Structures are given as C-alpha cells and as structure tokens.
mmCIF file of C-alpha atoms in Angstrom:
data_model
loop_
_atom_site.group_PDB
_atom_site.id
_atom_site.type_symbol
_atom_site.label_atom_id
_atom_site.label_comp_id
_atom_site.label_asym_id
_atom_site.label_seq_id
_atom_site.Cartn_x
_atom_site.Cartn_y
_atom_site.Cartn_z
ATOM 1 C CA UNK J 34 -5.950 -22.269 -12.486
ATOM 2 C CA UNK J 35 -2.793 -20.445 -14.015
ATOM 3 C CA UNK J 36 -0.712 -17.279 -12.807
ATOM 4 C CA UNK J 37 0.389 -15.387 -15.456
ATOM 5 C CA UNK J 38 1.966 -12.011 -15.144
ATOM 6 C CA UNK J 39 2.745 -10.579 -18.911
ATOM 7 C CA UNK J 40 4.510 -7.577 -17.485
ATOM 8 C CA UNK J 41 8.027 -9.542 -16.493
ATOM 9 C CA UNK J 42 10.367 -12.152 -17.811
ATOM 10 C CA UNK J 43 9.766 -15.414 -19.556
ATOM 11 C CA UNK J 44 13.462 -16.915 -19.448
ATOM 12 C CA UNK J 45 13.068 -20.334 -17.262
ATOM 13 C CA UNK J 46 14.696 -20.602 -14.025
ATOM 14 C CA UNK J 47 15.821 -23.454 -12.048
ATOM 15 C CA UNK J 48 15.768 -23.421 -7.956
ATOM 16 C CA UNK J 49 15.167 -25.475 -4.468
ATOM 17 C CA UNK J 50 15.241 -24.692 -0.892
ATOM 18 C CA UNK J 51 14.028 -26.330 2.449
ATOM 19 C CA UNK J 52 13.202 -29.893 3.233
ATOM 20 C CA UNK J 53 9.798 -31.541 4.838
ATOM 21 C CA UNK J 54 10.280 -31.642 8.525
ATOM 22 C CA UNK J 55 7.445 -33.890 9.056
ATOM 23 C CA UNK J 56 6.623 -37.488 8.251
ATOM 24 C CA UNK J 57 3.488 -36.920 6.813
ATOM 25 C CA UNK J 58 5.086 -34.107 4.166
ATOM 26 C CA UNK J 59 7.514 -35.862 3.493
ATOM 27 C CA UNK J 60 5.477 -39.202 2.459
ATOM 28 C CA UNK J 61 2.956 -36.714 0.620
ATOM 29 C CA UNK J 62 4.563 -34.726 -1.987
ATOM 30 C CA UNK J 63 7.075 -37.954 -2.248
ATOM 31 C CA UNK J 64 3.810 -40.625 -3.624
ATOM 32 C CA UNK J 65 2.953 -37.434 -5.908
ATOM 33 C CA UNK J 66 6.442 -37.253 -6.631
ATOM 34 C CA UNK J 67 6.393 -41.003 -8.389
ATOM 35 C CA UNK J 68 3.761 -39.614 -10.780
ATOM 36 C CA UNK J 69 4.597 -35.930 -12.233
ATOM 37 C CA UNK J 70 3.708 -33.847 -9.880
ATOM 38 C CA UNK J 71 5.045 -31.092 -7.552
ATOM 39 C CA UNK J 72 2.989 -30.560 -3.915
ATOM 40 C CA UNK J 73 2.661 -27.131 -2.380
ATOM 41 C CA UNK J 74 1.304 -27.039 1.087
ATOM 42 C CA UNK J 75 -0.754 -24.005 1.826
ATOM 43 C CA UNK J 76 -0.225 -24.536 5.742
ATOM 44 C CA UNK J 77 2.142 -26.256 8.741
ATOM 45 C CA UNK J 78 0.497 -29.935 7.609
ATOM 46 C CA UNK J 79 2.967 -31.390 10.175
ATOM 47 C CA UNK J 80 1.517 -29.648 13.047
ATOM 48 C CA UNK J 81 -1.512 -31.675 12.900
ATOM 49 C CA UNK J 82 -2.517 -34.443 15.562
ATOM 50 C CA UNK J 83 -0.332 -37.702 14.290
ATOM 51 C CA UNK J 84 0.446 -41.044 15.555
ATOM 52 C CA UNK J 85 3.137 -43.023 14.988
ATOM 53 C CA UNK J 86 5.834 -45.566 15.784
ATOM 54 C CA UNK J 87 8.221 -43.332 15.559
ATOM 55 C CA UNK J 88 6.844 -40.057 16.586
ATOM 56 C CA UNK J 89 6.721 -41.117 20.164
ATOM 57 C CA UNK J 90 9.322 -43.871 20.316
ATOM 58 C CA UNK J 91 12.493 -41.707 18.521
ATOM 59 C CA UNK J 92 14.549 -43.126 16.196
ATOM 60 C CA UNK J 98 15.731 -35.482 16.315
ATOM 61 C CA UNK J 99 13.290 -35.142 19.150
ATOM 62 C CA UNK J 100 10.027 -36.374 16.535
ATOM 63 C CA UNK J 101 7.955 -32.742 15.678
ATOM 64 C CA UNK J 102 4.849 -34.044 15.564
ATOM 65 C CA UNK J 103 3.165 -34.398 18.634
ATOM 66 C CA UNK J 104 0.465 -36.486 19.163
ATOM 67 C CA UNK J 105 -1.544 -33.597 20.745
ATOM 68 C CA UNK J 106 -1.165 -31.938 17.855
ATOM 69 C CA UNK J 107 0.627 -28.629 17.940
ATOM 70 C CA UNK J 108 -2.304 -25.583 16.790
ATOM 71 C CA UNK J 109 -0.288 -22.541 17.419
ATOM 72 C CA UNK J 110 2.279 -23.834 14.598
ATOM 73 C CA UNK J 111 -0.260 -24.924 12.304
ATOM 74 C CA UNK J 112 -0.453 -21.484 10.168
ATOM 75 C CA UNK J 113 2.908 -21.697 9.196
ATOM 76 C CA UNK J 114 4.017 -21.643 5.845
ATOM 77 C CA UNK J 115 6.725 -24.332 4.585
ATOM 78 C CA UNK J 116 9.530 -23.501 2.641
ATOM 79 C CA UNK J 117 10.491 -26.144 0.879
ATOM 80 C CA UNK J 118 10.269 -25.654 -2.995
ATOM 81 C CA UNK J 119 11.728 -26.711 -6.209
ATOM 82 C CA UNK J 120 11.308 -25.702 -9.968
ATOM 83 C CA UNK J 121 13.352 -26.838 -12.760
ATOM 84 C CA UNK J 122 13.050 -24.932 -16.091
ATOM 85 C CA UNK J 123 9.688 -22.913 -15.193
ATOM 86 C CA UNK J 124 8.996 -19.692 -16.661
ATOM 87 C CA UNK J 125 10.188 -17.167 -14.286
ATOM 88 C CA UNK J 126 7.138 -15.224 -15.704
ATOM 89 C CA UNK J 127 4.646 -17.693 -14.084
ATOM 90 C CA UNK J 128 6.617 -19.062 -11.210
ATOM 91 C CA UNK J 129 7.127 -15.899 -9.385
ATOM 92 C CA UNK J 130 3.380 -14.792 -9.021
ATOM 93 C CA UNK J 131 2.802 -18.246 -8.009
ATOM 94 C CA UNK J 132 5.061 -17.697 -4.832
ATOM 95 C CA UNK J 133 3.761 -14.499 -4.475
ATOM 96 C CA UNK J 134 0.039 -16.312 -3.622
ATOM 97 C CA UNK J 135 1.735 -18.750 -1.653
ATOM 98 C CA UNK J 136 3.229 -15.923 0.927
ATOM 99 C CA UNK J 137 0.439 -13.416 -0.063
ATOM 100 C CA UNK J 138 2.588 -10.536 -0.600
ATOM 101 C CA UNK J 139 2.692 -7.923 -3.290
ATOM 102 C CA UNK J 140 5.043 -6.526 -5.558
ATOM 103 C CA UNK J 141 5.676 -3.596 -7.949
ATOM 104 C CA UNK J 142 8.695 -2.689 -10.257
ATOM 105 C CA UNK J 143 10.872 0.381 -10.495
ATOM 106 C CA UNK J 144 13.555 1.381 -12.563
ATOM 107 C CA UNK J 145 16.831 2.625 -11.938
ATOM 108 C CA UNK J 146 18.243 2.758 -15.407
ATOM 109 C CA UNK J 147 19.047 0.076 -17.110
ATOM 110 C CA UNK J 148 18.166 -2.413 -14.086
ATOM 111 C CA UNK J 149 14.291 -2.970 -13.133
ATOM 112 C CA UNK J 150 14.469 -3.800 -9.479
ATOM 113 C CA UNK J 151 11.046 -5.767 -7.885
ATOM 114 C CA UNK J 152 9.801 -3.755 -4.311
ATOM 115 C CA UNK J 153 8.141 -6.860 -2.468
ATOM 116 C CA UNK J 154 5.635 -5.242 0.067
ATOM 117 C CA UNK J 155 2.436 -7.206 1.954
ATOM 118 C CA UNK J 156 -0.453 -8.123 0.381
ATOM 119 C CA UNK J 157 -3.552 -6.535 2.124
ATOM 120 C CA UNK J 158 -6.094 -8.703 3.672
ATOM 121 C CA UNK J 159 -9.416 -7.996 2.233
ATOM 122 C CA UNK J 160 -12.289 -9.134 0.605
ATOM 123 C CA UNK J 161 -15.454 -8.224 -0.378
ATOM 124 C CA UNK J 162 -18.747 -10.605 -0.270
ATOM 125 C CA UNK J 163 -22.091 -10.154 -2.084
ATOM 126 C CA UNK J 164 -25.182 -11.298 0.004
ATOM 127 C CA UNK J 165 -27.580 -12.642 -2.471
ATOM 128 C CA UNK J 166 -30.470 -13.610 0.006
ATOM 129 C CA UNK J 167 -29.837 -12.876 3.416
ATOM 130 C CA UNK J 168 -29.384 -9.257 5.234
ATOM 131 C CA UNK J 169 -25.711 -8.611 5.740
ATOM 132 C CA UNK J 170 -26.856 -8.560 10.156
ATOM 133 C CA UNK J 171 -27.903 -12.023 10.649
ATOM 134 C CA UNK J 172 -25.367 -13.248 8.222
ATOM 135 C CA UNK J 173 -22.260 -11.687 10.772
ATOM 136 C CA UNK J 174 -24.469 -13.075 13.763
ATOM 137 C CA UNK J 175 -24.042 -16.740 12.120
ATOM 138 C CA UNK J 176 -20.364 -16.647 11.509
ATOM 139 C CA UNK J 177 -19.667 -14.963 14.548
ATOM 140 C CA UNK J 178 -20.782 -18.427 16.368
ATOM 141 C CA UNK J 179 -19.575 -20.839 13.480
ATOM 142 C CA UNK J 180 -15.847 -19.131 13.950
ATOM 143 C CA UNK J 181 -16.280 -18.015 17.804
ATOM 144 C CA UNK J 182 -13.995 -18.863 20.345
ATOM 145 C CA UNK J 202 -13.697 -13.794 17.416
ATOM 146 C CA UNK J 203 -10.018 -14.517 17.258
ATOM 147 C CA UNK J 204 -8.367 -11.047 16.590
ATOM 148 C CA UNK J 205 -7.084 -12.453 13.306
ATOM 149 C CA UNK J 206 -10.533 -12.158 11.848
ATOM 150 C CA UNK J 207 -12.681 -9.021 11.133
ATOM 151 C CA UNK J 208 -15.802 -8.966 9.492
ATOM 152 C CA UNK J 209 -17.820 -5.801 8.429
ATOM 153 C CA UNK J 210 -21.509 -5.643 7.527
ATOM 154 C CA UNK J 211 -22.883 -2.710 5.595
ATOM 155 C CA UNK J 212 -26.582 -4.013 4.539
ATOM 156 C CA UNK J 213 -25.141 -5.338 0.787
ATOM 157 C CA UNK J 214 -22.515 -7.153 1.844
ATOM 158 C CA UNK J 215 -19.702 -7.970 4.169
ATOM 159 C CA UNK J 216 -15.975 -7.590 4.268
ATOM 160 C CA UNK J 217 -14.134 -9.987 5.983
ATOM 161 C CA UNK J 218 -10.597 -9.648 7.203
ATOM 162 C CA UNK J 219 -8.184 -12.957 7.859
ATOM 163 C CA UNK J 220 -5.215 -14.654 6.204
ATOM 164 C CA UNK J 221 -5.704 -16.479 2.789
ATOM 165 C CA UNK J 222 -6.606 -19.810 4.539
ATOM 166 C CA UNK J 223 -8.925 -18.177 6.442
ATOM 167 C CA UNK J 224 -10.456 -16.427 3.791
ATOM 168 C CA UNK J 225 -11.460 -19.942 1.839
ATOM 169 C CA UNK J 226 -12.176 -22.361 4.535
ATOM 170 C CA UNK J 227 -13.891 -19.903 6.827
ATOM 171 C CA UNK J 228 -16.345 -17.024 5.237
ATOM 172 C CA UNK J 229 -16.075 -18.145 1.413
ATOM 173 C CA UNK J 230 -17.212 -21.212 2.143
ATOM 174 C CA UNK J 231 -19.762 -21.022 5.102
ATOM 175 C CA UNK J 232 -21.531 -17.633 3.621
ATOM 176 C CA UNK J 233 -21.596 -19.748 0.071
ATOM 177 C CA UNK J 234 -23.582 -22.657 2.448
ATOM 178 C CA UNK J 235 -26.089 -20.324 3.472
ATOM 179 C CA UNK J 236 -26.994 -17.723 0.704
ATOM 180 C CA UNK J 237 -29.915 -19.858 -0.281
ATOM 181 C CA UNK J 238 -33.980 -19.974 -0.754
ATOM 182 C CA UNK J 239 -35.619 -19.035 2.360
ATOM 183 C CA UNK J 240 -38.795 -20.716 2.460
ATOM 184 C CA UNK J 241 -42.045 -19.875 4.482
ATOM 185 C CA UNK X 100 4.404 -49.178 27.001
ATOM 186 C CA UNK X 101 2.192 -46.365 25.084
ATOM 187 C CA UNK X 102 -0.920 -47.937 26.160
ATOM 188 C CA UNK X 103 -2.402 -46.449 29.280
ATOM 189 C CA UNK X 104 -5.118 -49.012 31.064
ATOM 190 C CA UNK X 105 -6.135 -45.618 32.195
ATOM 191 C CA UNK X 106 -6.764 -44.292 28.624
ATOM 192 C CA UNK X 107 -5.221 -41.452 26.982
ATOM 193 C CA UNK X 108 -8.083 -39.645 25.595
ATOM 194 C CA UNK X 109 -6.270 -35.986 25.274
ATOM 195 C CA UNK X 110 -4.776 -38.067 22.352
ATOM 196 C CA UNK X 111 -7.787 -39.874 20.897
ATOM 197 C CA UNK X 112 -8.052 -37.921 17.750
ATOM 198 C CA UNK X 113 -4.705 -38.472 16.725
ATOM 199 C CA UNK X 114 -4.599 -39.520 12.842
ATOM 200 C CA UNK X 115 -1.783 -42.692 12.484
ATOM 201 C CA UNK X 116 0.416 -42.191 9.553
ATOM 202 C CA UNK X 117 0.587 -45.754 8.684
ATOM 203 C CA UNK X 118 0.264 -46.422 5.263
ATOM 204 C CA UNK X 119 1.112 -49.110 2.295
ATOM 205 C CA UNK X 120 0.632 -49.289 -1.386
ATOM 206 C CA UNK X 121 1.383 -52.000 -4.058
ATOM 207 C CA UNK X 122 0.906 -50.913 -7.554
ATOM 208 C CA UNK X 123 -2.306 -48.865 -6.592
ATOM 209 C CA UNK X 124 -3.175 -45.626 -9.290
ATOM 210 C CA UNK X 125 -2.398 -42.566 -8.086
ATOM 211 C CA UNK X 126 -6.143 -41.664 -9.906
ATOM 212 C CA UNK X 127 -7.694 -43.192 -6.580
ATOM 213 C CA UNK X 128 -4.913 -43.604 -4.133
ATOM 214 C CA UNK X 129 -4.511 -39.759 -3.539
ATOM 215 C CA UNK X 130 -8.355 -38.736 -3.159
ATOM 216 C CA UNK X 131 -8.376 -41.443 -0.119
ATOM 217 C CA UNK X 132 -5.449 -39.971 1.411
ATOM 218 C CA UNK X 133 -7.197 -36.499 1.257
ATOM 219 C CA UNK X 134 -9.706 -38.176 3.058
ATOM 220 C CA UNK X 135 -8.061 -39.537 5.615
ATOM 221 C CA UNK X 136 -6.375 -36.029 6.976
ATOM 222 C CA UNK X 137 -9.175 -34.085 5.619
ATOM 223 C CA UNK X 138 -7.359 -32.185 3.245
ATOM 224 C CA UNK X 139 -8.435 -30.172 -0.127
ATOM 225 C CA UNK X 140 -6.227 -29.791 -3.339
ATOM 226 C CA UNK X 141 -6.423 -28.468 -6.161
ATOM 227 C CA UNK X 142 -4.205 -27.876 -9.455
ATOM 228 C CA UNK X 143 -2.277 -24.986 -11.147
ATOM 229 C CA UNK X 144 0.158 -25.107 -13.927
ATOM 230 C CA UNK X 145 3.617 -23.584 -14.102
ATOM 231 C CA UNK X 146 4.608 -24.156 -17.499
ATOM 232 C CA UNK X 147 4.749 -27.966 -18.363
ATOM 233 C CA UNK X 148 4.763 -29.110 -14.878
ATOM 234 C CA UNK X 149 1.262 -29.556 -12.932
ATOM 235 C CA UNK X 150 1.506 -28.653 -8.986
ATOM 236 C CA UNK X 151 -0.875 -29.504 -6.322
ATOM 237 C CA UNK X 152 -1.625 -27.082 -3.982
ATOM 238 C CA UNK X 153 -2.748 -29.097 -1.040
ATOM 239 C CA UNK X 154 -5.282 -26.615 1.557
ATOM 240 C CA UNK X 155 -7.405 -27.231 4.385
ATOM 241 C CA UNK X 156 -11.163 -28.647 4.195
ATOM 242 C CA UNK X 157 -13.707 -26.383 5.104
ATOM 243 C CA UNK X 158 -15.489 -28.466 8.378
ATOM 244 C CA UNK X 159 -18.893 -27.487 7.626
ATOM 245 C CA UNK X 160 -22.286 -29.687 7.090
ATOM 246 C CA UNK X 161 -25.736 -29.226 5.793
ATOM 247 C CA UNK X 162 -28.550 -31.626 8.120
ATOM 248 C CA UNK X 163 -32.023 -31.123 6.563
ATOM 249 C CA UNK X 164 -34.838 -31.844 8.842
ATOM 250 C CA UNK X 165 -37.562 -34.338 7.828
ATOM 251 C CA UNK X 166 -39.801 -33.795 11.217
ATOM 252 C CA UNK X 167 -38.565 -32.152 14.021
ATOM 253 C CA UNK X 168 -38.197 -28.842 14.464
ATOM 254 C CA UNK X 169 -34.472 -27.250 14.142
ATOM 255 C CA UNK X 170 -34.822 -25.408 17.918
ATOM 256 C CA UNK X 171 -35.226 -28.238 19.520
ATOM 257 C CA UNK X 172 -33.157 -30.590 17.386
ATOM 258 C CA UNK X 173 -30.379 -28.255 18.780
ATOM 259 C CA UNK X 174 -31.557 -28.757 22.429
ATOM 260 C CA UNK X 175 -31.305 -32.647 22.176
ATOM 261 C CA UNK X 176 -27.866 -32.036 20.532
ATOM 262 C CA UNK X 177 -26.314 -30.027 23.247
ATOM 263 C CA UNK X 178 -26.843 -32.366 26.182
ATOM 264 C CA UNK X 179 -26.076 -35.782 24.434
ATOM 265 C CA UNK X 180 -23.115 -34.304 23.134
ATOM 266 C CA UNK X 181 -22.286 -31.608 26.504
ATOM 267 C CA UNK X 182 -19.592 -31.674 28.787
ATOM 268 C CA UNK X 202 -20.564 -28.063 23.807
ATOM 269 C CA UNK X 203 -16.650 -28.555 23.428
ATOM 270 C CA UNK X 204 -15.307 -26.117 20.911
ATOM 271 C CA UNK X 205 -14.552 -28.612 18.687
ATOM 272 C CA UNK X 206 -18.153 -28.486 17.729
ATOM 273 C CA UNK X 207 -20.539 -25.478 17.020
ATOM 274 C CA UNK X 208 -24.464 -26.405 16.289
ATOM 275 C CA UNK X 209 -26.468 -23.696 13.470
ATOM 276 C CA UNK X 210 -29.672 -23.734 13.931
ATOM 277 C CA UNK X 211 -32.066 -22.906 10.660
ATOM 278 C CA UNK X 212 -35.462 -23.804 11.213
ATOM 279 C CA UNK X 213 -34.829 -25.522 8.486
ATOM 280 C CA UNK X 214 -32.058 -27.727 9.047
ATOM 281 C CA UNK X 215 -29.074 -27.529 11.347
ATOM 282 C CA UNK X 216 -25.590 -26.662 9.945
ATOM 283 C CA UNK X 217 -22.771 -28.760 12.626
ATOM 284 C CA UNK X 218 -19.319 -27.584 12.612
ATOM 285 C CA UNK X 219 -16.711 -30.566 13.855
ATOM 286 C CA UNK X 220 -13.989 -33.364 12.390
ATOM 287 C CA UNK X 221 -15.010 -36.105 10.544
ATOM 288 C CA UNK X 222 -15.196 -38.742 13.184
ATOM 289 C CA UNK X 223 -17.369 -36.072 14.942
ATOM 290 C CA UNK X 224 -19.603 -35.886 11.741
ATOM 291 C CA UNK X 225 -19.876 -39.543 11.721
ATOM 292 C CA UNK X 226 -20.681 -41.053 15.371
ATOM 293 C CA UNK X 227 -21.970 -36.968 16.276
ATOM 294 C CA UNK X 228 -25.205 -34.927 14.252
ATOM 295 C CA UNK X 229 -25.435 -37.396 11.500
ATOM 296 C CA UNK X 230 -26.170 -40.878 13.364
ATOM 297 C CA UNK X 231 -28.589 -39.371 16.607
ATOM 298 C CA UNK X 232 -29.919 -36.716 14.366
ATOM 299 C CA UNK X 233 -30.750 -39.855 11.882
ATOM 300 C CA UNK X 234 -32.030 -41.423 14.727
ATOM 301 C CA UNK X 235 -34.673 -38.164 16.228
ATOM 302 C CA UNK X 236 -36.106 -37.681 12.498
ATOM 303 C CA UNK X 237 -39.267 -39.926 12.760
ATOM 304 C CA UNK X 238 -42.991 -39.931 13.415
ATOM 305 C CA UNK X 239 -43.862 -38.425 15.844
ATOM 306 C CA UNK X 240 -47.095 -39.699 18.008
ATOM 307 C CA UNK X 241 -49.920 -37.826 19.205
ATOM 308 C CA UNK L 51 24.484 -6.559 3.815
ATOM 309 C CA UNK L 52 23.300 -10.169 3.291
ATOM 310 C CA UNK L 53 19.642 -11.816 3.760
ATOM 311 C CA UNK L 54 18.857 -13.421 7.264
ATOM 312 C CA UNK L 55 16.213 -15.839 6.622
ATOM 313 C CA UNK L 56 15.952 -18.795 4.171
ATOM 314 C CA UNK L 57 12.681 -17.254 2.574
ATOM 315 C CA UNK L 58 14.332 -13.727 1.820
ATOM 316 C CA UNK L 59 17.301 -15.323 0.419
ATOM 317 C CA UNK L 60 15.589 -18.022 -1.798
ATOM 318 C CA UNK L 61 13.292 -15.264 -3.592
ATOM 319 C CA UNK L 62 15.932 -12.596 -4.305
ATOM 320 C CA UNK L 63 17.814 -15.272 -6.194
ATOM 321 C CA UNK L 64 15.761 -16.445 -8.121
ATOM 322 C CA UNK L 65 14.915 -13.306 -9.106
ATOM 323 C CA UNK L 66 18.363 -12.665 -10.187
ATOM 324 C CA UNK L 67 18.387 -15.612 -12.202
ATOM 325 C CA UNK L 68 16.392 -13.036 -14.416
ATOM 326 C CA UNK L 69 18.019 -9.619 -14.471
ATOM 327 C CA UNK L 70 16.085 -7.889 -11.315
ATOM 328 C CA UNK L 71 16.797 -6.536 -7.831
ATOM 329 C CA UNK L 72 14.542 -7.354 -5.518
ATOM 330 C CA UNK L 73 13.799 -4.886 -2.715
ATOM 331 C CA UNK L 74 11.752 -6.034 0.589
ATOM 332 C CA UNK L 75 9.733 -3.367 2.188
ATOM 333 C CA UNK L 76 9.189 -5.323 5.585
ATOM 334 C CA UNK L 77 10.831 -7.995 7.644
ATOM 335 C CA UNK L 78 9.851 -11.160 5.562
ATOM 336 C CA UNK L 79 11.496 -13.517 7.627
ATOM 337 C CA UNK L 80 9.969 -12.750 10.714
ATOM 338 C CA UNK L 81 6.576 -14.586 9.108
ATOM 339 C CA UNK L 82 6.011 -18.219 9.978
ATOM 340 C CA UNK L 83 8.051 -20.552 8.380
ATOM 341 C CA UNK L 84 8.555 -24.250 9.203
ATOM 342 C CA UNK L 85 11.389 -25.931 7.111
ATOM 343 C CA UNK L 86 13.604 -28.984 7.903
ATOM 344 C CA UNK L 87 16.606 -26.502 8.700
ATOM 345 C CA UNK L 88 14.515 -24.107 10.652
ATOM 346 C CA UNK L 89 13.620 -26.446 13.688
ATOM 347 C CA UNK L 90 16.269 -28.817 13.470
ATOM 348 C CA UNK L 91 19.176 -26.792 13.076
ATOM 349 C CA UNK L 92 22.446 -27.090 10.364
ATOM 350 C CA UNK L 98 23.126 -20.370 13.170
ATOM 351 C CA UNK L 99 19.795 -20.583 15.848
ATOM 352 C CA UNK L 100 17.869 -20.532 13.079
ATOM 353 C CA UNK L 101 15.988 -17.251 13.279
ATOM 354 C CA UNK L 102 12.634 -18.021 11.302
ATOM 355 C CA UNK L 103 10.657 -19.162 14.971
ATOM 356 C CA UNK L 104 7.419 -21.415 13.011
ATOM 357 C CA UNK L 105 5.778 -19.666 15.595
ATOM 358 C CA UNK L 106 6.298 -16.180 13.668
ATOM 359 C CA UNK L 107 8.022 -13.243 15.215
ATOM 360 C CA UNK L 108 5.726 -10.436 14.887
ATOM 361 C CA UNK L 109 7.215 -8.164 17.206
ATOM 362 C CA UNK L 110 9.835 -7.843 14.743
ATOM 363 C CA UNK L 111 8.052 -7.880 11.288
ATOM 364 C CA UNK L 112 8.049 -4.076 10.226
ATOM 365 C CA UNK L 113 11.716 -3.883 10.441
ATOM 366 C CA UNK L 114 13.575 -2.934 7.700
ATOM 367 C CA UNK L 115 16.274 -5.250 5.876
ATOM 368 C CA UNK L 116 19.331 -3.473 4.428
ATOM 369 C CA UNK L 117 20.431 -5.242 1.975
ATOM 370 C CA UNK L 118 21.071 -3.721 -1.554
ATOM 371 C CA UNK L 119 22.848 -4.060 -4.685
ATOM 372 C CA UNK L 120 23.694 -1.089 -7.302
ATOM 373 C CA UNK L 121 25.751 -1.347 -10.855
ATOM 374 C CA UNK L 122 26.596 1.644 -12.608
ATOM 375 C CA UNK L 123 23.103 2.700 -10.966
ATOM 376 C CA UNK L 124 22.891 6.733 -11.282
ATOM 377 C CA UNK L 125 22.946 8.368 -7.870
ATOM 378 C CA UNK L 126 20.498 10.855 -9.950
ATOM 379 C CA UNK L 127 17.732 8.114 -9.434
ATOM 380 C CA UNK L 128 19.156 5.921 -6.929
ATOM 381 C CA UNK L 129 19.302 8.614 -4.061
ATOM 382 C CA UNK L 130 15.402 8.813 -3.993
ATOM 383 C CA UNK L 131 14.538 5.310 -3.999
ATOM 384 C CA UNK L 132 16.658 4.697 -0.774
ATOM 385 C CA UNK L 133 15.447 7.715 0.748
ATOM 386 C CA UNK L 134 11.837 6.270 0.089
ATOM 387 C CA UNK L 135 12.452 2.485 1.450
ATOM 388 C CA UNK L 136 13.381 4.263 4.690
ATOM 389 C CA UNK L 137 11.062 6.728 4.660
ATOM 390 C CA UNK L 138 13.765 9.684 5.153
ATOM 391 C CA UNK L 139 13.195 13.638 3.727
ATOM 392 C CA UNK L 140 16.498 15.599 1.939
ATOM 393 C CA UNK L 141 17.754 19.175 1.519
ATOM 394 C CA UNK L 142 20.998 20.437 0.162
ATOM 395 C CA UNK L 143 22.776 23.203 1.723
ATOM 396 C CA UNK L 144 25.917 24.899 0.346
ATOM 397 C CA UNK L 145 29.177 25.203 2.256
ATOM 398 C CA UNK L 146 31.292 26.945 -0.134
ATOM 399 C CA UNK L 147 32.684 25.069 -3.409
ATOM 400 C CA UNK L 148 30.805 21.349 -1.479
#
C-alpha cells in the first residue's frame, strides 16, 4: 500500500522525534533497522505481558510489567524518523497513523493545513447472513460492549464504531470469518 | 529469588524477550518473531524507503466439526476449561465452533480436546 | 504561543519544512502517547500514555501570520474559536 495525496507538496523533508521506551521496541525496529527498513507501531507494543532479566531485576523503574499493563496498550508511540521523504506522501502517512483529518485554507499567499479528527466509521456489507444474528455474534466475541465500540444493524449491513485497531482486528476480520455458505 | 515454590500464575502468560541471532536472514527471522508476540505487519512505501507497519493479530479460529454436534461441543468446552475466563469466548455454529483466546490457549485449549471429542461415536 | 506536547510540535514542523501553517482544531496532545521522554522524564511531561480525555476538545492557541491580510485572517480566527462579529461606529473609529 502507498499514500499519496496529489493536492500538496513534493519537496522532501527530513525529521525525528521520540525514542522506544520499551525493550521489546527498541530490539524490533533496531533488527529491521540492520536491513532497510523503518518500523511503525500501530499500538503501545511495550505494554504487553514481558519477562525479563531486567524488567524485574533493574538495571528507570523497568515499564514493562510482567502483568502486562492493558489500560496503556492503545497508546500510540511517537517515535519517528524520515530522511529525504516526499513531504507529499509522508504527511498522509502520519495522518493514518493518528487517524486525524485535515483540510487546507488560504490566507493569501500562505496555504495553512486545519488538522481536525478523523471520524470513526465504517460501513460493512453482509453477503450471507442477516445483519441481527451477525450483531448477536460479535456482541459475545467482543463482550466484556466496551463503550469504545458501537455497532449498528439495519438489515443490509452494519456500521461499526471503534478506533482504527479496533476496526481491523475486531469486526473486519471476525464478520469476514463468518460471511460464508450456510449449509442445510 | 523470582521463583515462587508457591507459583506465580497471575504472571504465567508473560512472553520472555530473550532472543539471539547469528547471521540468520531477516526473510525468516522476522516472520518468527511475529509469531512469537503475535503480531501482524504489513508494508507501505514512502518514497524509496519501505516501512513496516507492525499491528495487532486478530485472535480468532475456525474448528470444523467432523462428528459431534457444535451445541454440545461447546458444553464439554465450558467445564474442562471453567473456573469461562474472559480470555476465552466459545462461537458456536452448528457447524463448527469459532474460539477466541492467545496462542498458547489455541494450542493446549479447543484445538487438542476438541481433536480429541471428534471420533466415532458408539451406539 | 508555543506547542505543549511532543506530537503537536513534531507535525507543525515538519510541515513548515514545506511552506504551510498548520492549524489544530482540538487538543492533540491530550491523545495517548507513549514515548521514551513522556514516561521517563528529560517539564512533567504532560502527554499521560493513559490519554487525557477530559481535556481533549480544548483549544490550542498557537498561531503564526506574515504579511497575512486582516481582510481574510479575521474570519479564520473567528471560526477556530467559534466566535460571531459586528462592527459598530463610534465616531471617526
């Protein structure tokens, strides 16, 4: 995949920010480092349940907690770094990674970007199964409903409502699992 | 002395990031590391440099059914495996069963007792 | 004004690497963001991993103009804060 957005600037760019706070970041995105390659983490891959000689011995005070650490897992890290990319494809690529949404105004000679929030929605066709039963299975797959998940049937289809990582591992992927050939 | 004679199993499914490589390819170093955590990549191109965008796997299983019946397939589930933690959810789907848990869970869970149910039954 | 976060300033720059002036309509630092800096410290660090959501619609005010015309930079600022206008006369002002 490629984002491409032939409305703004091609001239390259050059940045960085951040470092991994983790050991398992930082030894990912450092092995992909030796060949040419550039991680992005969609999620807080540090606030997983990990082990380790130093995590519970010392050495800072070792974030990473054996028990894991869930209510810090749907962070985002910022830790990024470009080097002569296309300012034309970089930015919408950050703009995926933070899912927010911008538009561009003029005020003369300057064209000035107006970052706003990208809104959570989504729309999925039911190919073989009634949009009543389908909400009644994913309503036990991803029961605990957390209130940051919404999903809407209306007899064609369903709309569900989470963050973008929610939106792939949860109803993408469970309601492409079961629109399939009933048998009888 | 991390070691407990008591146990310590609030932190039994703990991952350890131990790791070593000698000259291995990154071709089939990196899918077994994506393995281990149970992650999911994939690739996007800014320009002449590629970039992995590591995710999140999607925990979710398909168990077809070879001769028992997916109602009470469930039943048999729910009291070996009782204590049903949330860590596991069981679909039925009269034609298979659909379980929802970590890989260890997938392994030594549905897929080795529900291997071991599916088989003639006498009369 | 300058940017509070490390997220808010690092886009923003970059940005004006190319010739633009970026313009947040909400609080993007009070997302969740987990950095080296942000837990460990260098300020208190005000990005919380945990989010801050309580303080997400705020408003940052931060801006930059250049030989911008008041003409047409008047009604953008009075539309990032969603304010309303009216001239009245006082004599010769």
């Amino acid at each position: 995949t490629v984002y491409r957005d032939p409305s703004l600037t091609s001239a390259p760019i050059t940045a960085n920010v951040g470092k991994y706070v983790g050991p398992l970041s930082t030894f990912l995105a450092s092995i992909a480092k030796s060949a040419g390659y550039e991680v992005v983490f969609n999620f807080n891959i540090d606030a997983l349940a990990l082990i380790n000689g130093e995590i519970v011995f010392g050495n800072t005070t070792s974030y990473a907690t054996p028990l894991g650490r869930p209510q810090e897992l749907p962070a985002k890290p910022v830790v990024h770094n470009f080097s002569n990319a296309p300012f034309n494809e970089a930015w919408p690529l950050l703009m995926d990674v933070y899912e927010l949404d911008y538009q561009l105004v003029k005020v003369g000679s300057a064209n000035v970007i107006r970052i706003g929030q990208r809104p959570k929605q989504l729309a999925l066709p039911l190919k073989f199964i009634s949009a009543e039963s389908a909400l009644t299975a994913i309503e036990k797959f991803f029961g605990e409903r957390p209130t940051g998940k919404f999903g809407l049937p209306n007899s064609i289809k369903v709309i569900p409502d989470s963050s973008n990582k929610r939106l792939i591992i949860g109803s993408n992927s469970e309601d492409g699992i079961r629109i399939r050939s009933f048998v009888e």
